[PDB]
C-alpha cells in the first residue's frame, strides 16, 4: 500500500533498455524531486538517481530518470547482467510531510545460463533422536535463477506438516542457497523405509533420499 | 563518509528500543537524517527525519505518536525511539544520510549499515548443537545443525577459524515456533575423514553461549 504506485516487475534480455515507471499526485511526484534507488539481494540501497534526472558521481550514463506531471520512470539502456536488482523511487510529499516509497519492482535480466541446485540432505543424528526428536536437514546451494520448490516424501507420499523452508539467499559467487527442514518423531523416522526432500529448479528436480538403516 | 549504527535490539510486544547512528563528520548540522525500515524480503519504508541545522523533524503518518527522533551534537549522533513495539516492526532499520547547505533536503546517499529489531513473544534460549555426520566425487559433505535458539545471531565457524574453504553456512529459518534453527556444512576431501579433526565453534551471544562440536565419521 505504498503511496507511489510502481510495477511489481520488469524484464529484458541484455543490451535492451528497461524503463520502470511510478506514479504518485500532485502532492508529492507533481511538485517534488523524485530519486531513485538500487539495492541488489542482501545489501543496503543505493541512490542512483536523484533530483528527476540527475546521477550521483560514479552511476554508469545507461541509468537516466525523468518525470513529468505526477510520474516518473527510470530508465536502464544497455542493461547487464549486473542490474539485476530492486529499485525503489521516492519523492517528498507535501499532504504528509514526509518521505514517500515507490513498493519496488523487480528488474530480471533474461536469457542467463541457468544452474542447477547442489543438495544435500542429512538423516536425524543419533543424539538428536535420544533426544527424542528428530530433524531431516535439507542443504540446497549454487542455483541460479534463485527460485525453487521444496517438496518432502515419506516413501512415495507427500508431507505436508512440520516442513520449514527459507527463502532464497544470494550467495557470494551470486547464485542462491536455501535449506528446508522436516520435522519428525523418532517413531514417524524409523517406521518409514525412507524419506525423500526434492528440489525443483526450473522445471527439472533434483531428489536426495536418506534411510533409517 | 561514514554512519555506524548500534548493534541488534530484542523485544517483547509492548516495550520501546532506542537505535543509534554515529556520524563521521564533525558536525550533523551539514546533513539532513532518515530512518527507513524493511521488512524480510518486503519494500523500503521512511518512518522519520531530522534537520539538525533547522531543529526540524518529520514523520510518517503510520508511526506518529509511537516515534522520536532526536540528535546529540555534541556526539554527533542520531536516535531512533520506537516505543508500543509490535511483532510486525520485525525488520533491519537504517539511518541515511544527505548533504545539504523537507523534500529539498531529504534524500538518501549515505546509508548505514543496518540494525536489527526483532519483536517477539518469545524468550531468549541457547541452541541445541547435534553433528551432521558425513559422499560423491572423492569427497564428503559433514555439518552441524544449530537447533531452536532465539534471538538471532548465531555465528559458525570450523576449526577455530582455521577452516574456511568448501563451508556454507546457511541462514536461519525462523519456525512456526517462534524459534530458529540454522546449519552449517563443509564439503571435504573424503580422504581427510581418517585424520583431520572437524569441529564447528557455535556462537550464540544473546545467551553467552559458545558450543564447539566435534563431528565424526558414522
Known amino acids: 500500500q505504498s503511496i507511489l504506485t510502481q510495477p511489481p516487475s520488469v524484464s529484458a534480455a541484455p543490451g535492451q533498455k528497461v524503463t520502470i515507471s511510478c506514479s504518485g499526485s500532485?502532492?508529492?511526484?507533481?511538485?517534488?524531486?523524485v530519486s531513485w534507488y538500487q539495492q541488489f539481494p542482501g545489501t543496503v540501497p543505493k541512490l542512483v538517481i536523484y533530483?528527476?534526472?540527475e546521477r550521483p558521481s560514479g552511476i554508469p550514463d545507461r541509468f537516466s530518470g525523468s518525470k513529468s506531471g505526477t510520474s516518473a520512470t527510470l530508465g536502464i539502456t544497455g542493461l547487464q547482467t549486473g542490474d539485476e536488482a530492486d529499485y525503489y523511487c521516492?519523492?517528498?510529499?507535501?499532504?504528509?510531510?514526509?518521505?514517500?516509497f515507490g513498493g519496488g519492482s523487480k528488474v530480471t535480466v533474461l536469457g542467463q545460463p541457468k544452474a542447477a541446485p547442489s543438495v544435500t540432505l542429512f538423516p536425524p543424528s543419533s543424539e538428536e533422536l535420544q533426544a527424542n526428536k528428530a530433524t531431516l536437514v535439507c542443504l540446497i546451494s549454487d542455483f541460479y535463477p534463485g527460485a525453487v520448490t521444496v517438496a518432502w516424501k515419506a516413501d512415495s507420499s507427500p508431507v505436508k506438516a512440520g516442513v520449514e523452508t527459507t527463502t532464497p539467499s544470494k550467495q557470494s559467487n551470486n547464485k542462491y542457497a536455501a535449506s528446508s527442514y522436516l520435522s519428525l518423531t523418532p517413531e514417524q523416522w524409523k517406521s518409514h523405509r525412507s524419506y525423500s526432500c526434492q528440489v525443483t529448479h526450473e522445471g527439472s528436480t533434483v531428489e536426495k533420499t536418506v534411510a533409517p538403516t | 563518509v561514514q554512519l555506524v549504527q548500534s548493534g541488534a535490539e530484542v523485544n517483547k510486544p509492548g516495550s520501546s528500543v532506542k537505535v543509534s547512528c554515529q556520524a563521521s563528520?564533525?558536525?550533523?548540522?551539514?546533513?539532513?537524517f532518515s530512518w527507513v525500515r524493511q521488512a524480510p524480503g518486503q519494500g523500503l519504508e521512511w518512518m522519520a527525519g531530522?534537520?539538525?541545522?533547522?531543529?526540524?523533524?518529520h514523520y510518517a503518518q503510520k508511526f506518529r505518536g509511537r516515534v522520536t527522533i532526536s540528535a546529540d551534537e555534541s556526539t554527533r549522533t542520531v536516535y531512533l525511539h520506537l516505543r508500543g513495539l509490535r511483532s510486525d516492526d520485525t525488520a533491519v532499520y537504517y539511518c541515511?544520510?544527505?548533504?545539504?547547505?523537507?523534500?529539498?533536503?531529504?534524500?538518501?546517499?549515505?546509508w548505514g549499515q543496518g540494525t536489527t529489531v526483532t519483536v517477539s513473544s518469545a524468550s531468549t534460549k541457547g541452541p541445541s548443537v547435534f553433528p551432521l555426520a558425513p559422499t560423491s566425487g572423492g569427497t564428503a559433505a559433514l555439518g552441524c545443525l544449530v537447533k531452536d535458539y532465539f534471538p538471532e545471531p548465531v555465528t559458525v565457524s570450523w576449526n577455530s577459524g582455521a577452516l574456511t574453504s568448501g563451508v556454507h553456512t546457511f541462514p536461519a529459518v525462523l519456525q512456526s515456533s517462534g524459534l530458529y534453527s540454522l546449519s552449517s556444512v563443509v564439503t571435504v576431501p573424503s580422504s581427510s575423514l581418517g585424520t583431520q579433526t572437524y569441529i564447528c565453534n557455535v556462537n550464540h551471544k544473546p545467551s553467552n553461549t559458545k558450543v564447539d562440536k566435534r563431528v565424526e565419521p558414522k
Open positions: 541515511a544520510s544527505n548533504s545539504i547547505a523537507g523534500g529539498y533536503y531529504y534524500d538518501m546517499d549515505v
Open positions: 521516492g519523492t517528498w510529499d507535501s499532504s504528509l510531510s514526509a518521505v514517500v
Open positions: 533530483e528527476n534526472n
Open positions: 500532485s502532492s508529492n511526484i507533481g511538485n517534488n524531486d
Open positions: 531530522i534537520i539538525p541545522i533547522f531543529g526540524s523533524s
Open positions: 563528520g564533525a558536525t550533523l548540522n551539514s546533513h539532513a
